[PDB]
C-alpha cells in the first residue's frame, strides 16, 4: 500500500524548508496503463522529513524520506514526475524505492515549476532499445525527446534544456567595430564547419547574419556542471583572464613598470624561479580571483611566480637539442602530424600559377642520413617529414601583411636512425611569390649546425617550424578535431536517443562538460580579439584557417589504426595483435595509443551484443537511425555529400561509430591537451607566434644573430606580454579538476540495472589498470629511454589511464572537459 522512498538532493549553495508543500513527486507505472496506453500516475506526494541514517552520503547532499500510496494494482513504477514549488532551484541526485529495489539516477537541476512548459520527468535505471520499451512508457519516452528538441526558435534561457544546432556566427563583434567583423563559419562551400549549440540571441544591428553579444552564452542546463570546490571550475578561468587579468597586465606595460621585452633566456626562466615583479594594484586584481589565484605563487604584494614546467625539471637547456625537437613529434604535445616520406624531393599540390614554382629546393646529396643513400633510406622506410607547406602557403601572404606577424610555410625532413630515434636533417622555409610582390624576402633551406651564426639560423628555423606546429596543434589537432568535431554528436545524442537507450548510456559519459567549455570558448577563447587571436600568429585569420582544414576532415580516418596507415607511419599487418605494424617501433603516442584503442574496442564489442543480436536489429532501431542521419546531415552537414560516412545498418558499423567517438573524446583529447603547459610552459620550446622573417646579411639584425643570439631569438618569437597571457591559459587547460571522471570510471555505480553490462564495464576497468602497469614497465625500460624520456628526461605518461588532481602530465578523462 505504501512505498518507502528516499530522495537525495543538493541545495543551490535549511533542510526543513524543503518540507511542507515545497516539493512533490508522482510515481508513474511502467506496467499498468490508462485508457490511452500511458502509464498510470500516482498522487502528488511531498517530502516528509530529513533522513539521516546511512553514512554513505556526502557532496553537500541531503536525504529526505517520502512514502507513496501505491497498491499492487498500480503495477511496477518505472518513472516519476517532480515539481519544485520553492523559488530557488535545487539539484536532484536520485530517488530510491525500497522493496526488489528500484533506482533512479537523476543528476539534474529542478527549477521552480512555473518556469516549465511540461513537468520534469525521470526514468528508472533500466535500459531499453525502442522495440523493448514497456508499452506504458513508449509515449512518455518520445514526448521527452520532442521536449529536448524544441522548435528551433527563441532566445534560450538558463533553465532551458533544449538541444539544437547553429553555425559559428557569434564570434565577431561588428556592432562594436567593423574591425571585429568575422566570416560566418559553417553553411557555405567557402567556409564549411561543424555546427555548435544554438543560443538564439538574435542578430546584431549592423549585420543580420551575425549573432548579437551576450553576457552569458547558453548551454542546456545540465551541461553546465556545478562544482563543490570553486577551484575546480577551471572553465571560468578564460573569461577572467581575457576580461580582468589581461587589462591589468597591459596597464603595467603601458605605464612602463616592467621591461616590455624579454632580453635574455634567463628573463624567461625567472618567471618560475624568483618570479616577475608587478605594480601593487596589478597583483591585487589577480590574487583574489577563483581559479586564476591558483596559477601563480605570490608574496601578496608585487610578485607572481609560475610553476616550473616539466620540460625543464631535469635540464633547462635540453629543449634546444635536435634530439628533443624531433622526439616531441612522436611524444610531445602534438604527436600526430608526422608522415612517412616515400619519394624525394617532396611534392606540392598547390597551384604554381598563384604561388610561383612549388618545387622543393632541398637536395638529397646535402643531407646526413648516417651513411645511408637516399634510395636506401626511402626503401627501408626510414624517411619522414613534418609537412606544413601546403597547409600554410595559402595564408602566408595575408598573415605577413599584419603588423608584428611574419611566418613561413615550413617542411621538416626527419631520418629514423639505426638506434631507433629520429633526427632532423633539413628545414625548408617557403614564401609565396607573385608578379608585383613588394617584399624582397625569399624562400630558403636551412641545415643542422652546432656552431657560429649557422647554428643561430638553424635554431631560428626550428622556431619557425614550431610556430607552424603550435598553431596547427591549437586550432586543428586540439580545437577542430576534438572540441568542435564532437559537439554535433553530443547534440544529436540528446535530441534522438532517449536516456533509456543503451547507446545513450554508452556514449554520454564521454560528453561531460564539452558543450560548456565550448560555449565559454566561443565567448573568450576563439572570439574576435579573444585569447587565441591576441596570442597566436594568425590573429584574425585563426578560426577561418580551421574551416579550410575541415574541408579535408574524415570521420573514419580519426580511428587510430586508419590514422597511422594514412600518415604512412604504420602498415596493415594481419599477423600482428593490433592489425598494424609500426614503422617507428618506439613511437610512444602510437604504441601506448594502440593499447588504449584495443581496450575500448573490446568494451564496445562486448556491450553492443548485449542489446543487438543481429544486423537487422540495428537497421530497425528508429532512434539510432534518426540519431545518425541527423548527426551527419545536420551536425556535420557541410560534409554530408562525402562517400566515407558509415551506414549504421550492421553491428559492425555501430561498433565502429561508437569506438571512434569514445576514442576522440577520451584518449585523443588527453594526448593533445595535457602536455600543453608541461612542454609549452617554456615559451622558447613552444613559441605561439613569429614576428619577423630571417635577416639579410649586412643589416644590424643579422649582426645581432652573431653577437646576441638569445635576443635575436626572443625578438622573433612571441613577445613578453602575450607570453604572460598564453602561459596562464595553457596552465589552466593542463590542470585536472579534482572531480574529474576518468576512463574506466562512471559518476554513479547504478547507471544501469543490467548486471551483464556492469560486469563488462568492470572488465574494461581492470584491463586499463593492467595496461598502466605495462606502460610503467615501458617507461622503466632503459632500451626505450631515447624516445620515451629524451634528453629532457620526461617519462611519457600522457596515456596512463589514471591520475590525481592537478598539473600531472597523465590521466585520461572520459571526455573533452577542459
Ligand atoms: Fe581541450
Amino acid at each position: 500500500h505504501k512505498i518507502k522512498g528516499t530522495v537525495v538532493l543538493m541545495p543551490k549553495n535549511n533542510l526543513n524548508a524543503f518540507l511542507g508543500r515545497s516539493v512533490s513527486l508522482q510515481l508513474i507505472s511502467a506496467t499498468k496503463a490508462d485508457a490511452h496506453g500511458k502509464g498510470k500516475v500516482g498522487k502528488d506526494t511531498f517530502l516528509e522529513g530529513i533522513n539521516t541514517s546511512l553514512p554513505t552520503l556526502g557532496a553537500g547532499e541531503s536525504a529526505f524520506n517520502i512514502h507513496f500510496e501505491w497498491d499492487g494494482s498500480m503495477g511496477i513504477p518505472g518513472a516519476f514526475y517532480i515539481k519544485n514549488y520553492m523559488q530557488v532551484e535545487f539539484f536532484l541526485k536520485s530517488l530510491t524505492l525500497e522493496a526488489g529495489t528500484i533506482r533512479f539516477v537523476c543528476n539534474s537541476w529542478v527549477y521552480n515549476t512555473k518556469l516549465y512548459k511540461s513537468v520534469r520527468i525521470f526514468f528508472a535505471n533500466h535500459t531499453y532499445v525502442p522495440s523493448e520499451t514497456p508499452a506504458p512508457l513508449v509515449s512518455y519516452r518520445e514526448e521527452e525527446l520532442k521536449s529536448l528538441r524544441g522548435n528551433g526558435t527563441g532566445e534560450r534561457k538558463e533553465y532551458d534544456r533544449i538541444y539544437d544546432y547553429d553555425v559559428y556566427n557569434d564570434l565577431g563583434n561588428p556592432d562594436k567595430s567593423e574591425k571585429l567583423a568575422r566570416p560566418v563559419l559553417g553553411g557555405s562551400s567557402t567556409f564549411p564547419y561543424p555546427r555548435r549549440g544554438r543560443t538564439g540571441r538574435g542578430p546584431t544591428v549592423t549585420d543580420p547574419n551575425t549573432e548579437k553579444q551576450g553576457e552569458v552564452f547558453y548551454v542546456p542546463r545540465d551541461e553546465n556542471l556545478g562544482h563543490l570546490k570553486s577551484k575546480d571550475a577551471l572553465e571560468i578561468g578564460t573569461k577572467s583572464l581575457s576580461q580582468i587579468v589581461q587589462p591589468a597586465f597591459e596597464s603595467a606595460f603601458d605605464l612602463k613598470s616592467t621591461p616590455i621585452e624579454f632580453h635574455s633566456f634567463q628573463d624567461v626562466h625567472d618567471l618560475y624561479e624568483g618570479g616577475i615583479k608587478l605594480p601593487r594594484d596589478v597583483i591585487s586584481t589577480i590574487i583574489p580571483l577563483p581559479v586564476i589565484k591558483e596559477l601563480y605563487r605570490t608574496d601578496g604584494q608585487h610578485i607572481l611566480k609560475f610553476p616550473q614546467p616539466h620540460v625543464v625539471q631535469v635540464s633547462q637547456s635540453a629543449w634546444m637539442t635536435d634530439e628533443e625537437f624531433a622526439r616531441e613529434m612522436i611524444a610531445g604535445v602534438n604527436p600526430c602530424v608526422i608522415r612517412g616520406l616515400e619519394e624525394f624531393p617532396p611534392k606540392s599540390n598547390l597551384d604554381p600559377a598563384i604561388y610561383g614554382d612549388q618545387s622543393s629546393k632541398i637536395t638529397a646529396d646535402s643531407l646526413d642520413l648516417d651513411g645511408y643513400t637516399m634510395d636506401e633510406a626511402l626503401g627501408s622506410r626510414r624517411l619522414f617529414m613534418l609537412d606544413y607547406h601546403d597547409i600554410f602557403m595559402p595564408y602566408v601572404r595575408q598573415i605577413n601583411q599584419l603588423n608584428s606577424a611574419k611566418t613561413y610555410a615550413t617542411r621538416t625532413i626527419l631520418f629514423l636512425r639505426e638506434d631507433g630515434t629520429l633526427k632532423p636533417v633539413a628545414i625548408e622555409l617557403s614564401l609565396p611569390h607573385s608578379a608585383g610582390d613588394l617584399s624582397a624576402a625569399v624562400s630558403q633551406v636551412v641545415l643542422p649546425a652546432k656552431e657560429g651564426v649557422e647554428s643561430t639560423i638553424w635554431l631560428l628555423a626550428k622556431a619557425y617550424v614550431i610556430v607552424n606546429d603550435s598553431c596547427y596543434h591549437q586550432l586543428m589537432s586540439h580545437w577542430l578535431n576534438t572540441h568542435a568535431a564532437m559537439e554535433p554528436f553530443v547534440i544529436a545524442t540528446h535530441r534522438h536517443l532517449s536516456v533509456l537507450h543503451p547507446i545513450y548510456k554508452l556514449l554520454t559519459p564521454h560528453y561531460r562538460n564539452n558543450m560548456n567549455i565550448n560555449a565559454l570558448a566561443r565567448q573568450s577563447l576563439i572570439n574576435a580579439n579573444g585569447i587565441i587571436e591576441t596570442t597566436f600568429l594568425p590573429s584574425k585569420y585563426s578560426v577561418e584557417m580551421s574551416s579550410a582544414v575541415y574541408k579535408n576532415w574524415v570521420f573514419t580516418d580519426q580511428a587510430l589504426p586508419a590514422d597511422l596507415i594514412k600518415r604512412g607511419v604504420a602498415i596493415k599487418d594481419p599477423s600482428t595483435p593490433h592489425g598494424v605494424r609500426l614503422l617507428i617501433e618506439d613511437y610512444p603516442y602510437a604504441a601506448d595509443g594502440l593499447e588504449i584503442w584495443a581496450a575500448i574496442k573490446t568494451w564496445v564489442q562486448e556491450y553492443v551484443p548485449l542489446y543487438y543480436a543481429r544486423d537487422d536489429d540495428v537497421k530497425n532501431d528508429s532512434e539510432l537511425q534518426h540519431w545518425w542521419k541527423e548527426a551527419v546531415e545536420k551536425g556535420h552537414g557541410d560534409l554530408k555529400d562525402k562517400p566515407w560516412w558509415p551506414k549504421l545498418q550492421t553491428l559492425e558499423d555501430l561498433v565502429e561509430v561508437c569506438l571512434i567517438i569514445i576514442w576522440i573524446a577520451s584518449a585523443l583529447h588527453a594526448a593533445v591537451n595535457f602536455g600543453q603547459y608541461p612542454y609549452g610552459g617554456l615559451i622558447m620550446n613552444r613559441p605561439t607566434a613569429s614576428r619577423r622573417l630571417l635577416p639579410e646579411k649586412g643589416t644590424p639584425e643579422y649582426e645581432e644573430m652573431i653577437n646576441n643570439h638569445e635576443k635575436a631569438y626572443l625578438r622573433t618569437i612571441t613577445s613578453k606580454l602575450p607570453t604572460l597571457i598564453s602561459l596562464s591559459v595553457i596552465e589552466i587547460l593542463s590542470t585536472h579538476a579534482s572531480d574529474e571522471v576518468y576512463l574506466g570510471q562512471r559518476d554513479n555505480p547504478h547507471w544501469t540495472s543490467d548486471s551483464k553490462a556492469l560486469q563488462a564495464f568492470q572488465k574494461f576497468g581492470n584491463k586499463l589498470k593492467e595496461i598502466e602497469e605495462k606502460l610503467v614497465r615501458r617507461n622503466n625500460d632503459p632500451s626505450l629511454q631515447g624516445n620515451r624520456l629524451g634528453p629532457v628526461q620526461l617519462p611519457y605518461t600522457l596515456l596512463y589511464p589514471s591520475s590525481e588532481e592537478g598539473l600531472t602530465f597523465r590521466g585520461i578523462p572520459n571526455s573533452i572537459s577542459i
Side-chain angles (χ1 to χ4, degrees), residues 2-12 14-818:
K2 297 190 194 69
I3 298 181
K4 183 171 181 294
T6 302
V7 177
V8 180
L9 60 78
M10 293 182 206
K12 181 187 178 180
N14 279 54
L15 311 176
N16 285 265
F18 289 96
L19 304 180
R21 297 179 71 75
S22 295
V23 185
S24 82
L25 288 70
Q26 288 170 283
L27 297 183
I28 300 173
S29 179
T31 57
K32 201 64 182 178
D34 56 32
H36 263 272
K38 298 176 65 66
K40 294 183 177 183
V41 186
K43 289 174 168 293
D44 291 303
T45 312
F46 302 81
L47 303 179
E48 59 187 66
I50 292 63
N51 186 319
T52 174
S53 302
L54 191 65
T56 302
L57 185 83
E61 291 166 42
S62 292
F64 289 95
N65 297 309
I66 181 169
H67 290 75
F68 305 82
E69 178 202 307
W70 198 266
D71 181 66
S73 58
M74 284 296 270
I76 307 175
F80 77 87
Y81 280 126
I82 187 176
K83 290 179 296 183
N84 175 17
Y85 290 109
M86 303 168 86
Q87 297 305 299
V88 184
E89 65 271 23
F90 61 76
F91 190 66
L92 178 63
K93 294 291 293 174
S94 65
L95 172 58
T96 303
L97 303 182
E98 310 164 305
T101 307
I102 300 180
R103 300 171 192 284
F104 302 73
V105 183
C106 313
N107 294 318
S108 179
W109 288 94
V110 179
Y111 279 65
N112 175 264
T113 189
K114 290 184 283 59
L115 299 170
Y116 293 128
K117 296 306 177 184
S118 74
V119 187
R120 291 306 305 287
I121 184 175
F122 293 96
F123 298 86
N125 75 350
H126 301 306
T127 305
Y128 312 111
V129 303
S131 68
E132 293 294 304
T133 307
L137 301 183
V138 167
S139 196
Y140 293 128
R141 178 174 178 148
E142 181 48 52
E143 298 311 308
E144 176 68 352
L145 288 173
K146 185 182 175 181
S147 175
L148 286 163
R149 293 195 286 270
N151 56 46
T153 71
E155 172 179 41
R156 295 279 68 86
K157 302 294 174 178
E158 180 185 304
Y159 49 78
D160 282 348
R161 291 168 55 253
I162 295 171
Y163 295 76
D164 208 340
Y165 316 88
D166 208 343
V167 292
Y168 281 74
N169 67 338
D170 59 341
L171 308 184
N173 189 0
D175 279 7
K176 177 174 181 178
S177 172
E178 282 162 50
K179 290 190 178 184
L180 302 168
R182 299 285 177 272
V184 173
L185 302 179
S188 74
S189 55
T190 301
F191 296 115
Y193 215 64
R195 295 293 176 276
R196 51 83 176 192
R198 181 173 186 281
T199 48
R201 298 189 293 278
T204 64
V205 297
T206 65
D207 176 15
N209 295 156
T210 297
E211 189 167 342
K212 69 169 62 186
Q213 296 287 301
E215 295 293 353
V216 175
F217 276 40
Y218 157 96
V219 291
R221 188 64 186 88
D222 300 324
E223 294 303 324
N224 181 6
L225 309 185
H227 301 279
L228 290 176
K229 307 171 63 176
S230 187
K231 67 195 302 180
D232 281 338
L234 299 170
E235 62 270 6
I236 70 181
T238 60
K239 194 169 179 295
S240 299
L241 184 58
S242 179
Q243 310 191 345
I244 305 171
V245 181
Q246 188 177 310
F249 280 157
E250 301 176 320
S251 70
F253 284 74
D254 295 339
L255 300 174
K256 303 185 181 181
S257 296
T258 191
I260 307 307
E261 294 278 320
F262 290 126
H263 292 302
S264 72
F265 287 176
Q266 185 53 43
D267 286 343
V268 178
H269 299 301
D270 280 336
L271 297 181
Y272 54 81
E273 291 170 353
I276 179 174
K277 296 185 197 301
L278 301 167
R280 285 177 169 290
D281 62 293
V282 174
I283 298 299
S284 296
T285 295
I286 298 180
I287 202 175
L289 305 172
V291 178
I292 299 304
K293 68 181 180 187
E294 309 297 335
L295 305 181
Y296 334 92
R297 289 192 69 68
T298 183
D299 62 344
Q301 292 176 276
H302 291 98
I303 302 174
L304 288 191
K305 176 199 176 182
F306 288 82
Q308 186 187 213
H310 283 80
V311 73
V312 298
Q313 284 179 12
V314 179
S315 168
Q316 69 157 43
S317 62
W319 65 269
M320 307 184 65
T321 64
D322 280 2
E323 293 69 33
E324 185 59 19
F325 167 77
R327 193 189 72 85
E328 289 186 18
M329 297 175 194
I330 52 170
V333 77
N334 190 212
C336 51
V337 179
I338 184 173
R339 286 172 175 259
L341 178 56
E342 297 188 72
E343 71 181 311
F344 202 89
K347 292 173 60 181
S348 168
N349 266 47
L350 297 184
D351 189 6
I354 301 167
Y355 309 105
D357 183 357
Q358 297 295 285
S359 303
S360 177
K361 288 307 303 70
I362 301 163
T363 67
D365 303 321
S366 72
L367 313 177
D368 185 327
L369 310 181
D370 295 337
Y372 283 67
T373 62
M374 179 55 71
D375 287 335
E376 295 177 332
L378 288 172
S380 63
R381 295 311 307 274
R382 286 184 179 281
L383 207 73
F384 299 83
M385 67 178 173
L386 182 64
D387 188 17
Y388 287 122
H389 180 277
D390 284 8
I391 289 160
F392 276 77
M393 188 58 71
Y395 279 88
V396 171
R397 185 176 296 286
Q398 61 200 83
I399 288 178
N400 287 3
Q401 288 296 305
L402 303 174
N403 298 303
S404 295
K406 293 294 173 289
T407 190
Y408 291 99
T410 73
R411 185 182 274 146
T412 301
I413 310 303
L414 303 139
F415 177 69
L416 178 64
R417 313 190 81 184
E418 293 189 345
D419 70 12
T421 61
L422 289 171
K423 74 164 186 173
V425 301
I427 289 168
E428 182 161 31
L429 303 176
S430 304
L431 295 171
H433 297 98
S434 66
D437 288 332
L438 293 160
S439 173
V442 300
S443 298
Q444 67 189 95
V445 175
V446 187
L447 304 174
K450 291 185 183 178
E451 309 178 305
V453 71
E454 294 92 344
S455 69
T456 299
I457 295 168
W458 169 254
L459 176 65
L460 291 170
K462 290 190 291 181
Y464 287 114
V465 166
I466 299 306
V467 168
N468 281 183
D469 199 83
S470 289
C471 286
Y472 193 88
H473 167 261
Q474 185 64 223
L475 294 165
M476 321 310 172
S477 303
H478 195 181
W479 174 263
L480 181 68
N481 290 357
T482 67
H483 291 264
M486 187 61 54
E487 191 163 356
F489 298 114
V490 180
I491 295 161
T493 299
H494 287 279
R495 285 178 60 85
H496 288 283
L497 299 186
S498 163
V499 287
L500 293 162
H501 203 291
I503 299 302
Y504 176 103
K505 295 188 190 186
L506 178 68
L507 303 180
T508 56
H510 302 290
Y511 304 153
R512 184 191 161 82
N513 217 32
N514 197 169
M515 290 186 72
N516 195 34
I517 190 71
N518 280 15
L520 290 166
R522 296 201 307 278
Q523 175 179 53
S524 304
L525 191 69
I526 60 165
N527 56 305
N529 249 71
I531 300 294
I532 288 178
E533 282 193 5
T534 60
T535 60
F536 282 73
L537 174 83
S539 187
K540 59 182 179 182
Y541 302 116
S542 297
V543 195
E544 58 165 282
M545 281 189 74
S546 69
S547 172
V549 170
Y550 180 66
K551 292 177 173 175
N552 285 103
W553 178 89
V554 181
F555 182 71
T556 47
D557 285 337
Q558 302 310 298
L560 185 56
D563 168 59
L564 299 172
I565 290 164
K566 180 180 184 184
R567 289 188 290 119
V569 298
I571 57 83
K572 190 174 175 60
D573 189 343
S575 68
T576 56
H578 300 299
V580 294
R581 172 171 177 252
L582 294 184
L583 296 178
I584 296 172
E585 300 201 306
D586 184 19
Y587 185 160
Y589 165 69
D592 293 5
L594 286 166
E595 296 306 314
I596 303 295
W597 172 267
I600 296 168
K601 185 176 183 180
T602 295
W603 156 232
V604 179
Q605 279 177 156
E606 194 182 338
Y607 185 84
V608 170
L610 296 179
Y611 301 97
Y612 298 84
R614 313 173 189 238
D615 301 317
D616 279 26
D617 298 315
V618 179
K619 179 180 184 180
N620 290 154
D621 184 324
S622 189
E623 282 183 13
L624 201 62
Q625 296 301 316
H626 281 87
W627 166 74
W628 193 243
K629 178 177 181 295
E630 195 182 76
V632 175
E633 294 184 27
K634 302 303 174 179
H636 278 281
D638 298 330
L639 297 181
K640 62 180 164 56
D641 59 313
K642 305 300 182 176
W644 42 255
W645 287 109
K647 300 306 176 186
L648 211 68
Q649 307 302 310
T650 64
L651 292 165
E652 191 179 307
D653 284 6
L654 181 54
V655 173
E656 170 179 48
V657 166
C658 293
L659 171 58
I660 293 176
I661 287 172
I662 298 172
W663 166 259
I664 293 173
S666 58
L668 180 64
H669 174 261
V672 302
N673 183 82
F674 295 98
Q676 288 181 93
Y677 191 90
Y679 283 114
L682 185 75
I683 195 68
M684 294 92 73
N685 189 51
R686 300 295 296 182
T688 65
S690 45
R691 295 185 279 163
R692 57 186 185 177
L693 301 176
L694 284 172
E696 293 290 8
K697 299 179 289 69
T699 63
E701 291 65 52
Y702 193 99
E703 299 310 310
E704 185 180 59
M705 292 192 305
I706 300 177
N707 302 308
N708 200 340
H709 78 284
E710 289 188 4
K711 183 54 177 183
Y713 192 89
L714 293 164
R715 282 178 179 285
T716 300
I717 67 165
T718 315
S719 191
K720 177 179 176 183
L721 170 56
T723 291
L724 293 172
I725 299 164
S726 67
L727 290 178
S728 298
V729 79
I730 62 173
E731 194 189 335
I732 296 170
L733 308 181
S734 304
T735 302
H736 286 300
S738 76
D739 55 2
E740 182 62 88
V741 182
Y742 295 88
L743 194 62
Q745 305 183 323
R746 293 246 163 172
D747 66 33
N748 192 295
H750 305 300
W751 53 281
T752 183
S753 56
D754 296 353
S755 64
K756 292 181 176 178
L758 292 172
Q759 286 165 31
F761 186 65
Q762 257 286 164
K763 287 190 282 196
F764 174 45
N766 289 324
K767 180 68 178 181
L768 291 169
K769 292 170 186 293
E770 179 175 293
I771 287 167
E772 195 170 305
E773 299 183 308
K774 187 182 195 182
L775 303 186
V776 168
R777 289 197 296 276
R778 286 180 181 173
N779 281 327
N780 292 310
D781 185 342
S783 68
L784 309 176
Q785 189 288 331
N787 293 344
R788 298 193 70 90
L789 271 72
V792 298
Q793 303 291 176
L794 179 50
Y796 188 74
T797 54
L798 284 170
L799 287 170
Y800 275 23
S802 70
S803 179
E804 293 300 322
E805 79 293 331
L807 210 170
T808 68
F809 195 61
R810 57 181 283 169
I812 305 176
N814 272 324
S815 65
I816 295 158
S817 68
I818 190 53

